[PDB]
Design a protein around this ligand. Structure first.
Ligand SMILES: [Fe+2]
Ligand SMILES: [Fe+2]
Ligand SMILES: [Fe+2]
Ligand SMILES: [Fe+2]
Lengths: 281, 281
């Protein structure tokens, strides 16, 4: 780990200037400039829209929200107990410091959404504790938590795993909400989804930038394996556990979109595409 | 640690709602609402003011800035490797997530200040690495770093130590800059100092709130001891190592102010005042 510019001991770690890595610094500034709070999302005119929905459309959205409820918390857990601690480069710690704060805002946003659409407290506890109630989302959670507690996996494998969590595990639900936007529905849900997605894309690109700054990283086959496993888990979630059919989407094109996102991630990582499919949406 | 509501295992840790502690949550919202970036501080009209200063007034300010250069970094180091990891209460992790992001902005601000006033790169490296060059600030730094690596000290003693770092170690330099403001000087320096101080007061109050949520905490005598040791170190820094006389301040009243701040901290902690002196300024 001493030959790793990103992980090796750094005595100038506590001071910001002079900037050592301008690429990392610019990433941080883009994140900082993107700051927003949950309060900025108007949900007053949304309780009505939630009613104008079909029993299946509410069933879908509520389940997606169930996954998003703790997801950002899990990510922050990793960033606090791991990434932010391991990396010694000031610029990177700055990016991670902001990522943690934004993930907590994302976490609040999703809770606010659930709280706003599900008035019945009985249903609430069922969704809030989705990682302890809904087996479907329990799997995506365990996958992520495993990478947090895995003491064998190198930073290289781990940073790739969370890039998958924030890119691939978010992609399906993201696309679903953007579909609703086109259909003119839930302006509160789709608007927050636009701000959050802008952050995730940023969290993903940073993950790829950290990967590039790693000297000894996992082989391509291992990266394809991790990405591919996340792809399947994400497809199984949106074409089986919770079919996007419930909102008028083709379960086939959704699977293809997931792969398209996995391919973009691979390119960003500096590798060749895995699936070689176009973005259907 | 299992009987500590703040440190015990929490399965609902990843989700924000429902709010368990509204007192902690409100602290977080106050912090969130106080957000600001370094870019918002106009330093264009400051290079001129730095010139209209006396050789001693620049000597003082540059040394205070030397301490502030890494101080926020050290604080963030503790919050990341310790506090944020130990505490399992969602609301508290949210406050700490924001504290970390703001400390990094504070860190940038001070670097920007130094970079802006000291054009010569020779002087810069001497101040940026003050914890490795200036013995005077090296002592205040080691004191803080010790609390970070001390594996024996309980969270109770440690949270009290950093409340002292952010309250007592900041107080002297803070008062000095507010003195300059009265004297109409360095509008860039005094303006940032107002925003930063607003955050520190908030970081200090939160520290006291966490202390209150601790069941088994250090005895009062131990708290007085930690606070008192910080007081002395801070006075020795501003009446010996770097006399506030250099900017037209009475070294005696400054020592009294430090004690007045130590007393406010004690009250906030739920204990009696130690020095019982009025705020001179
Ligand atoms: Fe997020
Ligand atoms: Fe994220
Ligand atoms: Fe600070
Ligand atoms: Fe602070």
């Amino acid at each position: 780990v001493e030959d790793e510019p990103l992980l090796r001991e750094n005595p100038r770690r506590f001071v910001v200037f002079p900037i050592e890595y301008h690429d990392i610094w610019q990433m941080y500034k883009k994140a900082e400039a993107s700051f927003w709070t949950a309060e900025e999302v108007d949900l007053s005119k949304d309780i009505q829209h939630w009613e104008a929905l079909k029993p299946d459309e509410r069933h879908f959205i509520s389940h997606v929200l169930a996954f998003f409820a703790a997801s950002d918390g899990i990510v922050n857990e990793n960033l606090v107990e791991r990434f932010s601690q391991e990396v010694q480069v000031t610029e990177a710690r700055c990016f991670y410091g902001f990522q943690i704060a934004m993930e907590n805002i994302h976490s609040e946003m999703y809770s606010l959404l659930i709280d706003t659409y599900i008035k019945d407290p009985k249903e609430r506890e069922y969704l809030f504790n989705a990682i302890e109630t809904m087996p479907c989302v329990k799997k995506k959670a365990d996958w992520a938590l495993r990478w947090i507690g895995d003491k064998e996996a190198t930073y290289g494998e781990r940073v790739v795993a969370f890039a998958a969590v924030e890119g691939i595990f978010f992609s399906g639900s993201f696309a679903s909400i953007f579909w609703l936007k086109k259909r003119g529905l839930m302006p509160g849900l789709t608007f927050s989804n636009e701000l959050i997605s802008r952050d995730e894309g940023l969290h993903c690109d940073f993950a790829c930038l950290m990967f590039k700054h790693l000297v000894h990283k996992p082989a391509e086959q291992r990266v394809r394996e991790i990405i591919t496993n996340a792809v399947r888990i994400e497809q199984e979630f949106l074409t089986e556990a919770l079919p996007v059919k419930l909102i008028g989407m083709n379960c086939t094109l959704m699977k293809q979109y997931i792969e398209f996102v996995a391919d973009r991630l691979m390119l960003e990582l500096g590798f060749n595409k895995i699936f070689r499919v176009e973005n259907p949406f």
